[PDB]
mmCIF file of C-alpha atoms in Angstrom:
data_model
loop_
_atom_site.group_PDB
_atom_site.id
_atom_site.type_symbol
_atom_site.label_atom_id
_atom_site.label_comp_id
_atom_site.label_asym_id
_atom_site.label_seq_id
_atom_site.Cartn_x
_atom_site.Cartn_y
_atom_site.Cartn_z
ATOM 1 C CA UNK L 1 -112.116 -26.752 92.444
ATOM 2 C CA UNK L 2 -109.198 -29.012 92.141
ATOM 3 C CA UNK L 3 -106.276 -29.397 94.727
ATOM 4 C CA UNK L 4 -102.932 -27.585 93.975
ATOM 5 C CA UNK L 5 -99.946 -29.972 91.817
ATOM 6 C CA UNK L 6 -98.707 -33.203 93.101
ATOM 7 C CA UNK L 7 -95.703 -33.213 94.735
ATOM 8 C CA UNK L 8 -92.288 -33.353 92.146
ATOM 9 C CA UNK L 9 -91.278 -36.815 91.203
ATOM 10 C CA UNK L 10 -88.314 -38.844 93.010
ATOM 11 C CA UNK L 11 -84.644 -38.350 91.740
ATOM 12 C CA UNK L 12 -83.630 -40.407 88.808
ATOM 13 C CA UNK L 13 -81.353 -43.106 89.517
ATOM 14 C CA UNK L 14 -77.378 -42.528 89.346
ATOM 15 C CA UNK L 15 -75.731 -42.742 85.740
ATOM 16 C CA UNK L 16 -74.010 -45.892 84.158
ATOM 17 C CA UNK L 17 -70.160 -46.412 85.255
ATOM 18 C CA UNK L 18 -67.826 -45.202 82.398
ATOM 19 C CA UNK L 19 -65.296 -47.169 80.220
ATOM 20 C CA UNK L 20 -62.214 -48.826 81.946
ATOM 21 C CA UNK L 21 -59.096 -46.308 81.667
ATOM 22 C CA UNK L 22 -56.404 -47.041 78.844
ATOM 23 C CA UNK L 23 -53.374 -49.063 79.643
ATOM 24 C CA UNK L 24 -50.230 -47.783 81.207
ATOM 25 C CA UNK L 25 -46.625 -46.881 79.464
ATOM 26 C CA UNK L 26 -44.084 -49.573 79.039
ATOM 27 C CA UNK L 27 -42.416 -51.010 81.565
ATOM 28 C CA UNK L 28 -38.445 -50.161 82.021
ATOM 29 C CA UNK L 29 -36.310 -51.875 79.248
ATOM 30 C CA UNK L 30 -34.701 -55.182 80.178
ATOM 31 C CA UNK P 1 -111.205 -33.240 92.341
ATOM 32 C CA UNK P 2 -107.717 -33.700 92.984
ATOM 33 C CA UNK P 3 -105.328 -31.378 91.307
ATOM 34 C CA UNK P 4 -102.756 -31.945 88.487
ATOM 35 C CA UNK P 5 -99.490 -34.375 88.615
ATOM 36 C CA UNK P 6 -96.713 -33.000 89.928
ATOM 37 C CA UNK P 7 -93.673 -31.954 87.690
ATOM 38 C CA UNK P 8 -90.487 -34.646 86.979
ATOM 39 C CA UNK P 9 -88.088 -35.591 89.116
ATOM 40 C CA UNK P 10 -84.644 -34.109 89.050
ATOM 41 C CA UNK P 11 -82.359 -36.226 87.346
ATOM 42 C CA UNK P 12 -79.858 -38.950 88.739
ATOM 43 C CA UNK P 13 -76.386 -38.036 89.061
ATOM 44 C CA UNK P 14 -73.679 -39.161 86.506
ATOM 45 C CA UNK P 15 -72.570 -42.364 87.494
ATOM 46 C CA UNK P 16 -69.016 -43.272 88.740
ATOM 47 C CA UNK P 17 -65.691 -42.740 86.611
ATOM 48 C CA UNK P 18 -64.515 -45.778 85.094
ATOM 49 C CA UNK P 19 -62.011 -48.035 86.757
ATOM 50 C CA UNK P 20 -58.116 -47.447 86.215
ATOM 51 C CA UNK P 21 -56.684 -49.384 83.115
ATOM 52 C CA UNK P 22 -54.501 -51.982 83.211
ATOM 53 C CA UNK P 23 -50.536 -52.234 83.367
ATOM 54 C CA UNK P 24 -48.771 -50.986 80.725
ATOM 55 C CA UNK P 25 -46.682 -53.588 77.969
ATOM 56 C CA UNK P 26 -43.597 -55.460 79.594
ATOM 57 C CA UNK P 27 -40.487 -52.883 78.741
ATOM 58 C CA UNK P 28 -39.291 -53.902 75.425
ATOM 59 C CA UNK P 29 -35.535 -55.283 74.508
ATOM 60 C CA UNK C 1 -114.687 -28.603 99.824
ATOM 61 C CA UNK C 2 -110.883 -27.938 98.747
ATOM 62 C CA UNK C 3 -109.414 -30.160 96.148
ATOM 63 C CA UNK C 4 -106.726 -32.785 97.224
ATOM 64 C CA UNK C 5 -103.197 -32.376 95.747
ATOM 65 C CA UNK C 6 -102.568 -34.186 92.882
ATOM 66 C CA UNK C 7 -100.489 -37.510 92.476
ATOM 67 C CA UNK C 8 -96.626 -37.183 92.423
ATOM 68 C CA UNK C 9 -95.087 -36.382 89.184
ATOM 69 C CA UNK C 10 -92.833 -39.282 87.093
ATOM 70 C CA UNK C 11 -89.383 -39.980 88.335
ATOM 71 C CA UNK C 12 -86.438 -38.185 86.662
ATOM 72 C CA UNK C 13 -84.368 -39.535 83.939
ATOM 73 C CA UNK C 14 -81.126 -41.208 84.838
ATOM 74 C CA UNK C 15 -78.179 -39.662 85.094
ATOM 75 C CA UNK C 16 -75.430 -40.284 82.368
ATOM 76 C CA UNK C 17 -72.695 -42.352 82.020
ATOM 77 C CA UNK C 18 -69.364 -41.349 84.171
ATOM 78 C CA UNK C 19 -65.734 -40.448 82.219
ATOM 79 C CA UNK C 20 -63.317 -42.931 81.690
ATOM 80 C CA UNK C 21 -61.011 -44.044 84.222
ATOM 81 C CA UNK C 22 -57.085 -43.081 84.610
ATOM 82 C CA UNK C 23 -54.498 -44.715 82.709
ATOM 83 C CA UNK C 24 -52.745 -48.011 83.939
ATOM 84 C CA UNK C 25 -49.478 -48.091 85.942
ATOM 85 C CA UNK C 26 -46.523 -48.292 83.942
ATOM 86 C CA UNK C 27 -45.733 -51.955 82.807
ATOM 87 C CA UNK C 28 -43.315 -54.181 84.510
ATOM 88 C CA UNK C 29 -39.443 -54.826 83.655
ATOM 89 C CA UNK C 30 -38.528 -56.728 80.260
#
C-alpha cells in the first residue's frame, strides 16, 4: 500500500516592502 | 508505492513597513 | 513492504506587501 503524505511544503518567502510614507508638515514660517 | 504529496507550505510573512517619508515643504512666508 | 512517504508538498505563497511607512519630519525653516 502506499506510504503516508509527504511532509508540508517550506514557508513562503516574506512579503514585498510597502510604499514610502507621505511627506512631513511644513517647516516653521520664516 | 510512495504515498501522496504533502500539503502547502504556510505562507511567508508580510514584508516590512515602508520607509519614513521625506521632510515636509520649507515653512512658507 | 510499507509504502515510503510521499514527496514534500509545494512551497507556500508569499506573504503580502507591508503598510506604508510614517510620515516625514516636519520641513525645515523658511
Amino acid at each position: 500500500p502506499p506510504g503516508p503524505p509527504g511532509p508540508p511544503g517550506i514557508p513562503g518567502e516574506k512579503g514585498p516592502a510597502g510604499e514610502r510614507g507621505p511627506p512631513g508638515p511644513p517647516g516653521p514660517p520664516g
